[PDB]
Every structure is written in C-alpha cells, then in structure tokens.
Amino acid sequence: ILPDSVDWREKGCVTEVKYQGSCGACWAFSAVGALEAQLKLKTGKLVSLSAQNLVDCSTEKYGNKGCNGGFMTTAFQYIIDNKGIDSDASYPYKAMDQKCQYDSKYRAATCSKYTELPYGREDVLKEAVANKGPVSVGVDARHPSFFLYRSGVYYEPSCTQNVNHGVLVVGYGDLNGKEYWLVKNSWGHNFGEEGYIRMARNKGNHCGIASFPSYPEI
Ligand SMILES: *[C@H](N)C1(NC(=O)[C@H](CC2(C)CCCC2)N/C(C)=N/S(=O)(=O)c2ccccc2)CCS(=O)(=O)CC1
Numbered sequence: 001i002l003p004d005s006v007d008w009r010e011k012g013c014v015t016e017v018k019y020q021g022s023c024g025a026c027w028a029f030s031a032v033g034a035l036e037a038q039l040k041l042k043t044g045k046l047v048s049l050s051a052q053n054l055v056d057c058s059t060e061k062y063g064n065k066g067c068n069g070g071f072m073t074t075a076f077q078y079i080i081d082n083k084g085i086d087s088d089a090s091y092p093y094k095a096m097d098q099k100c101q102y103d104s105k106y107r108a109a110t111c112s113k114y115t116e117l118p119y120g121r122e123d124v125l126k127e128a129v130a131n132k133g134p135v136s137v138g139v140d141a142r143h144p145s146f147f148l149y150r151s152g153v154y155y156e157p158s159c160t161q162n163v164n165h166g167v168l169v170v171g172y173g174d175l176n177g178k179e180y181w182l183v184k185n186s187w188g189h190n191f192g193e194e195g196y197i198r199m200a201r202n203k204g205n206h207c208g209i210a211s212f213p214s215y216p217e218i
Helices: 026-043 051-057 072-082 122-131
Strands: 107-109 113-116 135-139 165-175 178-184 196-200 214-217
Touching: 026 051, 026 072, 026 107, 026 135, 026 165, 026 214, 051 072, 072 113, 072 214, 122 135, 122 165, 165 196
Parallel strands: none
Antiparallel strands: 113 214, 135 165, 135 214, 165 178, 178 196
8 A cells, every 4th residue: 555645745755946047967867856755764864966967977878978868876886886976065066068077075875786676667656756766757748738838737638658858757647537657857946836846747757757667875
C-alpha cells in the first residue's frame, strides 16, 4: 500500500527552484535535485549541489554536451566516477559552458549508484517517489501549452512519449480527483506554480513522464 499523496518539500528534501537561463542544463538540474534529496536523507543537511559542475565536467566521456543537452543517468555516473560533486555555493551556476573546475576540497556529496525504472510504468514510478525519494524524469515539453502553463493539472492532447526536457518529480496527488505528478522545473520561480508544474498522472504515461525515470543513492 502506498500513500494517496506525497510532497517531498514537506520533508525538507527539496531546495529552492533554480533558473537555467539560456543554457540547456535541464538534465544537470534534474540530476542534482534528485541527489540533493538523498543527501538530506543521509546527512540531515539540505544543500544545493553544483549543476555547473555537471555542465563543465560530465561532458564528452558521458555523452553530454553541456548547454546543448545531456542525461541525468550519465551525470549520476560521473559523480560516482569522480568520487564527488561540489556544492552550488562553491561552484556557482553561470548558464554557460566552462572548463571543468571541480575540486574535491569543495565536495558536498557523493553517489554510489543509480537506478533506471522500467519504461512507462507509472505504478513503479509512484512507488519510487513514495519510498525512495524525488525521481529524475524526462518529459515532452515541446508544446506551447507547457511554456504557457500557469496552474492546475497540466494535460496536453498533442503530448507524446518522445521526451526532451529533464525535470524532477518531487511528489504526487490529486486535484479534485484529477491525479497528477508534482514536478520541479528549472525555469525559475516565475514559471507555472512558482517553479513547479503538476502534470497528469495515470493518463497513459502522459508526455512520457514515466518513460525514463531514474534516481541516485548515496
Ligand atoms: C534541457 N535543457 C534540454 N534537454 C536535454 O538535455 C535532454 C533531456 C532528456 C530528454 C534526456 C533523458 C531524459 C531527459 N537530453 C537529451 C540528450 N535528449 S535526446 O534528444 O538526445 C534524448 C535521448 C533519449 C531519449 C529522449 C531524448 C532541453 C531540450 S534541448 O534544447 O534540445 C537540449 C537541452
């Protein structure tokens, strides 16, 4: 049995909403967001981790292209391989590609492994969000309705399972029956519901939200 609703923000495991700007670092923000929750669960400290660190260092060897896109899974592997990731405070976000400047003296977190959930299974995603923590996912955000979203449960008839935008599921619930996934975006606090968007849940893997989910562990 799983809870009917979950919101990790209530558990102090979600940091402030970030603004990626003109740099396509959605994947980096999604990855750090997922790890930030695990760091809190392990150490009791809520610390924003360096998305810039991923943009600058989890590059070609990880199939990533910095401000031109990347993967949350390979970002997690970089953190594992690198034996650490710096704090956002020590390695701030500049919304541009930079030479890798990682330094272990600024290490704020580590990662031991990551898990990729089975394709399109919203029930498995629900269990992971309830029992493991926030989960990194990809969604189809190639529709004007996504950019124009303001509030309520988002549903786009033209959505597909071809995802292109990396975000973070930090909970789930229902708005007057309409089930949804609580998503933390990285487009600033002025987007949607102050940085978040509630997306249709149990509506046939709407916008591919359950297509490629993954979460790290410490
Ligand atoms: C993010 N700001 C940006 N998208 C990505 O970086 C994108 C995120 C995904 C779709 C990767 C897997 C989950 C989230 N990364 C990549 C590499 N996408 S892809 O088109 O090569 C892809 C691979 C596998 C499955 C689906 C798609 C927004 C869109 S962008 O401006 O084109 C690049 C940055």
